Write a protein that holds these residues in place. Structure first.
Motif, short mmCIF file in Angstrom:
data_model
loop_
_atom_site.label_atom_id
_atom_site.label_comp_id
_atom_site.label_asym_id
_atom_site.label_seq_id
_atom_site.Cartn_x
_atom_site.Cartn_y
_atom_site.Cartn_z
N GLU A 140 0.83 -1.16 -0.03
CA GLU A 140 0.06 0.03 -0.01
C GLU A 140 0.99 1.14 0.02
OE1 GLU A 140 -2.95 -0.26 3.16
OE2 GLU A 140 -3.80 -2.15 2.63
N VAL A 141 1.12 1.81 -0.99
CA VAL A 141 2.09 3.00 -1.41
C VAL A 141 1.75 4.13 -0.58
CG1 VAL A 141 3.24 4.48 -3.01
CG2 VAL A 141 2.33 2.03 -3.64
N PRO A 142 0.52 4.85 -0.87
CA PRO A 142 0.44 5.92 0.07
C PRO A 142 0.39 5.73 1.64
CG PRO A 142 -1.26 5.75 -1.77
CD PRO A 142 -0.74 4.31 -1.45
N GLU A 143 -0.23 4.80 2.02
CA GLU A 143 0.02 4.38 3.44
C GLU A 143 1.49 4.33 3.96
OE1 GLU A 143 -2.00 3.01 1.41
OE2 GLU A 143 -4.09 3.84 2.16
N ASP A 144 2.28 3.61 3.25
CA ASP A 144 3.59 3.37 3.93
C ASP A 144 4.49 4.61 3.41
OD1 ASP A 144 3.51 0.80 4.72
OD2 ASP A 144 3.79 0.01 2.86
N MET A 145 4.21 5.52 2.62
CA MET A 145 4.95 6.75 2.41
C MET A 145 4.55 7.76 3.32
SD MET A 145 6.66 6.28 -0.42
CE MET A 145 6.82 4.59 0.17
N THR A 146 3.28 7.50 3.87
CA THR A 146 2.83 8.49 5.11
C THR A 146 3.44 7.98 6.33
OG1 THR A 146 0.54 8.62 4.09
CG2 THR A 146 0.84 9.10 6.43
N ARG A 147 3.90 6.87 6.52
CA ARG A 147 4.73 6.29 7.54
C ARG A 147 6.06 6.55 7.33
NH1 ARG A 147 1.68 1.22 6.20
NH2 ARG A 147 0.19 0.92 8.02
N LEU A 148 6.62 6.73 6.17
CA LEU A 148 8.03 7.14 6.05
C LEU A 148 8.09 8.68 6.19
CD1 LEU A 148 9.64 8.75 3.44
CD2 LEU A 148 10.78 6.88 4.89
N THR A 149 7.26 9.66 5.62
CA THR A 149 7.31 11.01 6.00
C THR A 149 7.20 11.49 7.31
OG1 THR A 149 5.05 11.21 5.01
CG2 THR A 149 7.02 11.52 3.58
N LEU A 150 6.37 10.81 8.08
CA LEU A 150 5.77 11.29 9.29
C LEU A 150 6.97 11.05 10.36
CD1 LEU A 150 3.75 12.34 11.27
CD2 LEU A 150 2.75 10.14 11.62
N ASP A 151 7.59 9.69 10.14
CA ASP A 151 8.41 9.33 11.21
C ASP A 151 9.97 10.33 10.90
OD1 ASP A 151 6.78 7.31 12.05
OD2 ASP A 151 8.40 6.12 12.14
N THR A 152 10.09 10.72 9.54
CA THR A 152 11.20 11.38 9.44
C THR A 152 11.26 13.06 9.68
OG1 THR A 152 11.26 10.53 6.93
CG2 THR A 152 12.62 12.31 7.29
N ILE A 153 9.92 13.62 9.72
CA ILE A 153 9.82 14.96 10.30
C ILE A 153 9.80 14.79 11.76
CG2 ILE A 153 7.34 14.88 10.00
CD1 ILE A 153 9.64 17.96 9.91
N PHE A 444 -3.64 3.18 -4.34
CA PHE A 444 -2.71 2.74 -5.10
C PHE A 444 -1.83 1.71 -4.65
CE2 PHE A 444 1.66 3.87 -6.80
CZ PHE A 444 1.88 3.07 -7.74
N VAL A 445 -1.79 0.46 -5.27
CA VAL A 445 -1.14 -0.96 -4.70
C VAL A 445 0.01 -1.31 -5.69
CG1 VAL A 445 -2.86 -1.44 -2.85
CG2 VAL A 445 -3.13 -2.03 -5.35
N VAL A 446 0.90 -1.79 -5.34
CA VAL A 446 2.02 -2.43 -6.17
C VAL A 446 2.62 -3.68 -5.40
CG1 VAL A 446 2.91 -0.37 -7.41
CG2 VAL A 446 3.89 -0.98 -5.00
N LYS A 447 3.36 -4.52 -6.05
CA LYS A 447 4.18 -5.38 -5.60
C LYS A 447 5.90 -5.25 -5.87
CE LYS A 447 2.58 -9.62 -5.49
NZ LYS A 447 2.16 -11.09 -5.91
N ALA A 448 6.67 -5.51 -5.04
CA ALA A 448 8.09 -5.27 -5.03
C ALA A 448 8.81 -6.56 -5.13
CB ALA A 448 8.50 -4.38 -4.02
N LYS A 449 9.41 -6.94 -6.09
CA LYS A 449 10.37 -8.33 -6.00
C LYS A 449 11.77 -7.89 -5.76
CE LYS A 449 6.96 -10.49 -8.60
NZ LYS A 449 6.39 -10.83 -9.92
N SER A 450 12.36 -8.27 -4.59
CA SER A 450 13.72 -7.70 -4.07
C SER A 450 14.88 -8.36 -4.95
CB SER A 450 13.90 -8.24 -2.79
OG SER A 450 15.32 -7.73 -2.19
N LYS A 451 15.74 -7.27 -5.01
CA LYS A 451 16.98 -7.61 -5.66
C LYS A 451 18.20 -8.16 -4.91
CE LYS A 451 16.72 -3.63 -9.28
NZ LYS A 451 16.33 -4.44 -10.52
N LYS A 452 17.59 -8.31 -3.81
CA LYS A 452 18.54 -8.96 -2.58
C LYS A 452 19.85 -8.35 -2.31
CE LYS A 452 15.62 -12.32 -3.95
NZ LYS A 452 14.44 -12.19 -5.22
N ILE A 453 19.70 -6.87 -2.64
CA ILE A 453 20.74 -6.10 -2.08
C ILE A 453 20.69 -5.61 -0.71
CG2 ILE A 453 22.24 -4.09 -2.59
CD1 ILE A 453 21.26 -4.25 -5.30
#
Ligand code: HEM
Ligand code: NI
Ligand code: NI
Ligand code: NI
Ligand code: NI
Length: 460
Positions: A140-153, A444-453
């Motif tokens: 869930e892109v907007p939900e996790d970006m909200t987590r990212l930005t809120l914790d950052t500020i 807005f939803v996606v799926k990420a396939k890791s590059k294992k880095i």
């Protein structure tokens, strides 16, 4: 040559009010702009304003000698909880210049270097979560970006951890914040807002304020209950003194500042990162060109301040995303004196102007015919961009004080996202832009396939 101000369908004593009975008012205002042209008057029960859509007219609107920032009805409603803060205060008000001079050094280039370490701390947590998702689950892109930005500020600015990634449903503050902004909007629709029919809307509204205020008291609590020697945004709010007056901010204003920076300092950034990813997964080999740069530059476990500053194509994507859909799609202005706009439209002293930013960025005489296409290559040389042709961060001295903060965070995060993950449009997702004054895509939803880095260990 005095032209008469064009105006859409009128509706009795409600004027132009019934034309915006959607949850997408800004998008409705955009459709009107394509219909009536570069300028039109919008009348409300007690309000009169004019929306600008052409670079030519907005060019003169950004003339600070003629125009100053105006509190639109949206901002007048936000002032109910933002108050005397930095976003909802008049330029002539005592506390704007006072707080501006105190807080501006907290966004200097040297302050940005200090924030970077904590920015990676939160950015890694984002990568941690996506790395540890089972193959079937959705992102869930907007939900996790909200987590990212809120914790950052909260961390970079107040030395405080919301721990949104350690939370299931969105932070209690976010719920109160979103509902507050959602209440600020739609209240623009109420002909008689003081009608007791909205009493439950009001008492729900000032409950959300209490929640936001409760959080502020706790940030101040953790701070005054020291706590190591600090040098962040909150440190200057409590100790910083305005050189012009010699005075520190009173506590009523300080609490208004914290509320302001907690909301303004993450909401629009979240939408940007959401819009950017959407335009990337919708434009494959543009995402490819951007995916390479991340892998080519970020050659370390965790990014450095220098490495983010040299992710130049990533910034181009962010700007092009800010172009097509600015998360803060409008800022208001008022005429300091009687004057004539564009040598055609005469304005009384105090007349309001609304800069419709999305239609500004879609000026065919500025960008070309492909105004709807997503070409990040437009921002090859920023020199080739006309003055005031691209203003997603406002204008002049009333411009965004955290523009560098946002762009750095948005570049740092998006870069790591392209380095560590491939992205798939799990649905054929049709863009649904939810409006709460600000703009942010919904569902807005996606799926990420890791590059294992692997990563480093975020130590600083
Ligand atoms: C990420 C996308 C962002 C966008 C599109 C954006 C947009 C804007 C705009 C248009 C204004 C002018 C408001 C007006 O004229 O009515 C503004 C001001 C402001 N912004 Fe941002 N902003 C963003 C990020 C941020 C960030 C990261 C911060 C962090 C603190 C922030 C904090 C502020 C503050 C405090 C003001 C008022 C400053 C003043 O009036 O002196 N914004 N922003
Ligand atoms: Ni003439
Ligand atoms: Ni699925
Ligand atoms: Ni200091
Ligand atoms: Ni290309």
């Amino acid at each position: 040559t005095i032209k008469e101000m064009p105006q859409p369908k009128t509706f009795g004593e409600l004027k132009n009010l019934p034309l915006l009975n959607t949850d997408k008012p800004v998008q409705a205002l955009m459709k009107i702009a394509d219909e009536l042209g570069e300028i039109f008057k919008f009348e409300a029960p007690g309000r009169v304003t004019r929306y600008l859509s052409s670079q030519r007219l907005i060019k003169e609107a950004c003339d600070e000698s003629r125009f100053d920032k105006n509190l639109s009805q949206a901002l007048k409603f936000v002032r109910d909880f933002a108050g005397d803060g930095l976003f909802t205060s008049w330029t002539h008000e005592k506390n704007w210049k006072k707080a501006h001079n105190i807080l501006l050094p907290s966004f200097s280039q040297q302050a940005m270097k200090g924030y970077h370490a904590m920015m990676v701390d939160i950015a890694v947590q984002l990568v941690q979560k996506w790395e540890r998702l089972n193959a079937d689950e959705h992102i869930e892109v907007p939900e996790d970006m909200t987590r990212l930005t809120l914790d950052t500020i909260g961390l970079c600015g107040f030395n405080y951890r919301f721990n949104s990634f350690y939370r299931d449903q969105p932070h209690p503050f976010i719920t109160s914040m979103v509902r507050a902004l959602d209440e600020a909007m739609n209240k623009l629709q109420r002909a008689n807002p003081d009608d007791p029919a909205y009493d439950e809307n009001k008492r729900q509204f000032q409950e959300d304020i209490k929640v936001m205020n409760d959080l502020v008291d706790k940030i101040i609590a953790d701070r005054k209950a020291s706590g190591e020697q600090s040098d962040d945004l909150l440190t200057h709010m409590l100790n910083g003194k305005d050189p012009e007056t010699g005075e520190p901010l009173d506590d009523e204003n300080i609490r208004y500042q914290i509320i302001t920076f907690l909301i303004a300092g993450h909401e629009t950034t979240s939408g940007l990162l959401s819009f950017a990813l959407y335009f990337l997964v919708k434009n494959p080999h543009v995402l490819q060109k951007a995916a390479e740069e991340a892998a080519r530059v970020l050659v370390d476990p965790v990014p450095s301040y220098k490495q983010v500053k040299q992710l130049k194509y990533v910034g181009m994507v962010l700007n092009e995303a800010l172009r097509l859909w600015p998360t803060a799609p409008a800022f208001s202005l008022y005429a300091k004196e009687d004057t004539v706009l564009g040598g055609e439209y005469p304005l009384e002293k105090g007349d309001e102007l609304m800069v419709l930013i999305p239609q500004l960025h879609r000026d065919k005489t500025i960008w070309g015919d492909d105004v709807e296409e997503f070409r990040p290559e437009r921002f090859e040389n920023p020199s080739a961009i006309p003055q005031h042709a691209f203003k997603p961060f406002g204008n002049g001295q009333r411009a965004c004080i955290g523009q560098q903060f946002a762009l750095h965070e948005a570049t740092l995060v998006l870069g790591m996202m392209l380095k560590h993950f491939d992205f798939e449009d799990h649905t054929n997702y049709e863009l649904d832009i939810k409006e709460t004054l600000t703009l942010k895509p919904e569902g807005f939803v996606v799926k990420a396939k890791s590059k294992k880095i692997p990563l480093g260990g975020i130590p600083s």
